[PDB]
């Protein structure tokens, strides 16, 4: 890889600079290079990796949704035939999105997950695996769609099982995982009741554990709890 010649520490330094400059593609390339050094990532480093790729794929997803909407309107009754261009460009953006997802999943599989022994690292990586299979699922229309959905479900489920055993109900990683798995249920698995149940139970169990926290931990946990409440409000 093109980052092979750069020091791990320099790659991390530059990822931070890229974040400040809102250069998320660069940020992702630097973090990829860092991961490929083969050493485990710290908490802060894991965050840099996730931030970088979340922003890159987030932009791709937004673009894909715009194009998909235009494409769907083109195939409505009375719509004038404008040729293959809308499909082609949606496919281009889709292929790019899929490439990014495959890249992240690749890093997780080679070899971040297998070396992650602590609850916080293993849950975070499995959450990421769930997320990037969920993004693949959003654009999937073929033979492997069900298997993609199951790959997301399986990753989220393992993360859930570990998080329930090893982390307090207010742990931001546990909360973020639950938030996202709940969205998976609602948007991907056609299981809105599972989504609502998970969001509510997660919220209520966290509420009950807030008394144990410092002011700073309270702020962290309640921020994500509000997102759970936001989704519940949207869905009920």
């Amino acid at each position: 890889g093109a980052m092979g010649s750069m020091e791990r520490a320099s790659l991390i330094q530059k990822a931070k600079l890229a974040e400040q400059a809102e250069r998320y593609e660069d940020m992702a390339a630097f973090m990829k290079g860092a991961v490929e050094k083969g050493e485990e990532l710290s908490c802060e480093e894991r965050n840099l990796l996730s931030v970088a790729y979340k922003n890159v794929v987030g932009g791709q997803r937004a673009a894909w949704r715009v194009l998909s909407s235009i494409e769907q309107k083109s195939n409505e009754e009375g719509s004038e035939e404008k040729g293959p261009e809308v499909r082609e460009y949606r496919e281009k953006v889709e292929t790019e999105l899929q490439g990014v997802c495959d890249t992240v999943l690749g890093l997780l599989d080679s070899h971040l997950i297998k070396e992650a022994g602590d609850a916080e690292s293993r849950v975070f990586y499995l959450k990421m695996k769930g997320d990037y299979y969920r993004y693949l699922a959003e654009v999937a229309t073929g033979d492997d769609k069900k298997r993609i959905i199951d790959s997301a479900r399986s990753a989220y489920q393992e993360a859930m099982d570990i998080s329930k055993k090893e982390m307090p109900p207010t742990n931001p990683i546990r909360l973020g995982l639950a938030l996202n798995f709940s969205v998976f249920h609602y948007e991907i698995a056609n299981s809105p009741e599972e989504a609502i149940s998970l969001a509510k139970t997660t919220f209520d169990e966290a509420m009950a554990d807030l008394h144990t926290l410092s002011e700073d931990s309270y702020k962290d946990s309640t921020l994500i709890m509000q997102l759970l409440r936001d989704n519940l409000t949207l869905w009920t």
């Binding site: 997320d131 973020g176 938030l179 969205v183 609602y186 989704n231 949207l234 869905w235």
Partner: peptide, 5 residues
């Protein structure tokens, strides 16, 4: 769209 982190 719903919130994710």
């Amino acid at each position: 769209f719903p919130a994710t982190v």
